[PDB]
Design a protein around this ligand. Structure first.
Ligand SMILES: OC[C@H]1O[C@@](CO)(OC[C@@]2(O[C@H]3O[C@H](CO)[C@@H](O)[C@H](O)[C@H]3O)O[C@H](CO)[C@@H](O)[C@@H]2O)[C@@H](O)[C@@H]1O
Ligand SMILES: OC[C@H]1O[C@@](CO)(OC[C@@]2(O[C@H]3O[C@H](CO)[C@@H](O)[C@H](O)[C@H]3O)O[C@H](CO)[C@@H](O)[C@@H]2O)[C@@H](O)[C@@H]1O
Lengths: 417, 422, 438
């Protein structure tokens, strides 16, 4: 209509229960037909808002977003643990108060070019960059995980070829806020982001949660609750500059909590990070001039039977924080390492907390390491020979810092005696 | 029908007189329509209930026992009823307004059995955990405080037996966002919470503001404006693991700013904390392996006459930060201690900033203490860190001079902040 | 009636042509209906005014003088008008779009006091303080910048005398959330603010972005994306106590990222700050007992041709962080100083990172300074130039002064924030520990 406000349950001839994808695409075509002129009375393409009331909507056609200033909004993030439910014996399901996620719920009924499996694809090349698209307070549900030859129960594989939101083109000032994502192989994949905000979402039981790909700048990932799968990323970024990752509560069971490849001049600060495996925070492939500060790291063991034996393939020598790059700053972090001598790998090894594998000029200061066998000896800081000219202060006793003293500046944490 | 309701458009009841009845009636309708749990891969998606801006009396407790219910308004609606109730009554007619507003739920319940005085009770037993209930951008107002047997003027007691939102049952993925709470004995009490987010609320002039009880995991309390009363909690958690408390601006006048009982592996980081009393951040009953980092602490004196002599009963030896527990990390905090030296209790005591009362392996590093003597500004001698004999094997670095760090050097690792000069 | 209004469903006027008249008409309706302050424990609950997505010209200033008014939209609607106005004009017809969108308020007011040029003016005297006004998820667009005799092209001056939101009176519990501001000389100016939250906004290509004026207490500026102009402020506060500034991503090209005058007992913590000039964080005029912690600072050279020679007037001896006041705490920050040695001013100077110009008892600990001699050249293409320079870590070392303590400042403590040669300070009167070196 003329005021650019649409409701998927009030779309003529549309059935969002059967195919909300088709309904939303039809609405987008309606907006474009009405907003053809870019420069009439200092305006002309203001965009629109599409509302999803709470409900169960099947999406059978991918939505293509190629207009700036489109807002898609609902009235509920709608999360429930499909992982827990699919591991309750089927005979006990009738007594459960509910089974499925809810809220403003988009069920992704697409086949498994991973962009083709995305419920929402945002794509538009040329100039200017597509700008200020907003996704807010709805639920995207991939419904089931499926057999992938890995031997585990189908619903525990984290594999289905489905993506919640995939942004393929260079973008500016995008927002993803208050969402729920559940049971998607990839929740949110955003290429070439500038000044993006991913804020206050619930992104859990997805193979990978947040991936920022290609390159980007001046973006932020804040105040999210995030839990991924053992082959996937919780928070991943590549070739980003000026990224701020803060105030997230990241829980298991991603391969990692935060994974950077070629990320520079960024900050991973004040997050609560919980993993069941090593390699929680990975700065790789010349990830340089980053601040990693005041994070709470907990690494312990998977308590839940269905995922006992499942891990990310990495041993305890990896480090909880691993750095390959120059001139980083690792300051004021807390590391709690809770492992059984029996489950340490390789057998007889001493776990590593912070590992510098390559690069120069890294400043590691004022980090507290707490290790328990449920104390347990750990290496607080391991500087490999291929990393040098680092500065390591008050981040472990002399024994806990493994490093060439001739080419690294080391001040051991004073000991009790 | 499309699961969206407006409390002013529901044909049963009157939200001005009893919005409780209206919302309960709406919830009954949702349940009547959403009876089947597995139809076409769904069946119980929940609903949204909208409160337009307005004054709504609640006389019946709302019982929320369904997942995916959102209750939303269009205004947090805060104004200081504390200030207004202390303005002389003859001046009230000249004030532009008296009461809070926005999408306002007036809690007209009798006092509690704490949960019986709750405007919103979230309770459901069995399985699975009730999940993804959302409260957004409305106002809950307990209207008046009343006599508590002692003592001061009724409107300054912080007592009425009323709760804004009480969550009794184990819950997952709940959200409380953009709310206003005012004049409630308890604003928000959530038991047995997993992956909860309490985000960007205004929770003030309530006896206690945020209480996380029983136990919980992986939750967060972020970006809130919080002010409590002198016998209550600003932020309280018990038996939580993996709690993140960050970016809050906590102002007076709670008994404390953050109080943990048996909280482990959690983070109280990057908050601004202002109190009028000692005992601002309390880690108690084996609160262990927590990070307390880069907070700004200010302790000064109550300036406002109606509360001038009212306090939390704790003396200046208590500490602004008190820790009873193991293996915590206290890093990069600023402490401003602003007191009248003549009013320090006990008489002749040197005030304490960080106190370790019990536990081992606490790491305290790179904290700045600034202390001043001001009448209710000269530099004031303080004990930056006090380690009691019952706490040992701690590491204290660059958090005070040798005189400022009171601790047994034989069983703790102490590095005094370097002195000026050569 | 139910206190909910939609600007496109109002009987009088035309929000396309003058939304200000429409909104003022709505406010008069609210007041007419809400005249009594104490009827059944209520009576003035306020209202909500909704702006669907659309282009709305504002020709009459909106005056908000009631508590509990919410003005909300359905899109922050930002696009870079700066990029567009530096694309050759003959190419504009071929661009997918030109203007900002979302729920868009176009400020068509003449230049102001500056309050007269505000699209929204919040003002009320008497008691109590106006309270709990909310602005949410709409766009305020000042359309054009104009010539001001500064040499620059008119659209690059950052001058138009327009303000998005101006709050003139003492206020309590205000919120500004999810907004988009673009092409305004001043985005958001709030006087005398108590318990204010400015949260999750996009405030960019404005001369100044956030200014907290007069005085204030217990406020917070959190989770914003902010970019100002070379004569203006990104985040500014004066005579505030207990301000929390955190989780902001501040990018160029403000004169500064954070500027305090007489601000005390406040926290500037966990922000990402990127500037093209010195003087990124300024604590001035007895700014005391503040925590400046775990921020990521980047200072480098403007790479975009339209602004390549434009700057904030300050030289490299200024400092990235400058402090005039007592008893502050500077802990755990990262500083990247990424400049061309030939472009340092004055010629042959050693750049200063942290400068203590006056005051006593400042505690500076555990700060990492990384300094590189790089030549970022420039390019006509904005986002290309911007991303390439952020990712370019290929360089030789650059000598810097990590901490400079002027003679006017003393009794400070400087720990692990630089080697001895990097800390220029009187050792007799300050406590200095050099970062260990090899
Ligand atoms: O490990 C987190 C990972 O597992 C999922 C289910 O696949 O959540 C499980 C869950 O329970 C674990 O945590 C609680 C600790 O409170 C413990 O009692 C239980 O034994 C664990 O399995 O994890 C969260 C808390 O992190 C709980 O709410 C949930 O029941 C999945 O959602 C998540 O990605
Ligand atoms: O002290 C906080 C506590 O008191 C209440 C009223 O019960 O608010 C009072 C208030 O005023 C104090 O701070 C102002 C501004 O610095 C000062 O001028 C006044 O003398 C003080 O009493 O506190 C907030 C700021 O913390 C002000 O907005 C407010 O007027 C209550 O709301 C709060 O929980």
């Amino acid at each position: 209509p003329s005021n650019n406000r649409y409701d998927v349950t009030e779309w003529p001839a549309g059935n969002p229960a059967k195919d909300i994808g088709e309904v939303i695409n039809s609405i987008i075509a309606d907006i474009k037909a009405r907003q053809g002129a870019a420069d009439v009375d200092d305006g002309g393409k203001p965009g629109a808002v599409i509302y999803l009331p709470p409900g169960d909507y099947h999406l059978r056609t991918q939505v293509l977003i190629d207009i700036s200033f489109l807002r898609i909004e609902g009235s509920g993030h709608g999360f429930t643990s499909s992982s827990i439910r699919f591991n309750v014996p089927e005979e006990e399901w009738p007594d459960l108060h509910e089974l499925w996620p809810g809220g403003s719920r988009v069920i992704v009924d697409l086949p498994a070019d991973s962009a083709a499996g995305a419920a929402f694809l945002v794509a538009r090349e040329g100039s200017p960059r597509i700008s200020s698209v907003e996704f807010s307070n709805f639920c995207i549900d991939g419904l089931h995980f499926t057999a992938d030859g890995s031997g585990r129960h189908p619903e525990n594989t984290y594999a289905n070829g489905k993506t919640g939101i995939h942004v393929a083109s260079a973008n500016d000032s995008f927002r993803v806020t208050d969402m729920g994502f559940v049971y998607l192989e990839n929740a949110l994949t955003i290429h070439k982001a500038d000044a993006l905000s991913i804020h206050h979402n619930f992104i859990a039981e997805c193979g990978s949660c947040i991936e920022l790909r290609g390159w980007g700048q001046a973006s932020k990932i804040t105040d999210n609750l995030v839990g991924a799968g053992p082959r996937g990323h919780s928070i991943y970024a590549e070739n980003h500059g000026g990224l701020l990752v803060t105030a997230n509560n990241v829980f298991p069971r991603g391969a990692s909590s935060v994974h950077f490849k070629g990320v520079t001049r960024s900050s991973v600060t004040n997050n609560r990070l919980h993993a069941f495996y090593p390699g929680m925070v990975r700065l790789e492939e010349n990830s340089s001039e980053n601040l990693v500060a005041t994070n709470h790291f907990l690494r312990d063991h998977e308590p839940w039977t269905p995922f006992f034996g499942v891990d990310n393939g990495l041993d305890d020598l990896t480090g909880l924080l691993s750095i390959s790059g120059n001139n980083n700053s690792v300051i004021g972090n807390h590391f709690s390492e809770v492992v059984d001598a029996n489950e340490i790998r390789p057998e007889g090894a001493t776990p590593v907390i912070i590992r510098l594998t390559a690069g120069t000029g890294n400043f590691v200061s004022t980090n507290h390491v707490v290790a328990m066998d449920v104390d347990l000896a750990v290496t607080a800081v391991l500087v490999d020979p291929g990393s040098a000219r680092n500065t390591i202060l008050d981040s472990g006793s002399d024994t806990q810092v493994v490093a060439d003293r001739a080419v690294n500046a080391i001040r051991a944490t004073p000991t009790v005696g």
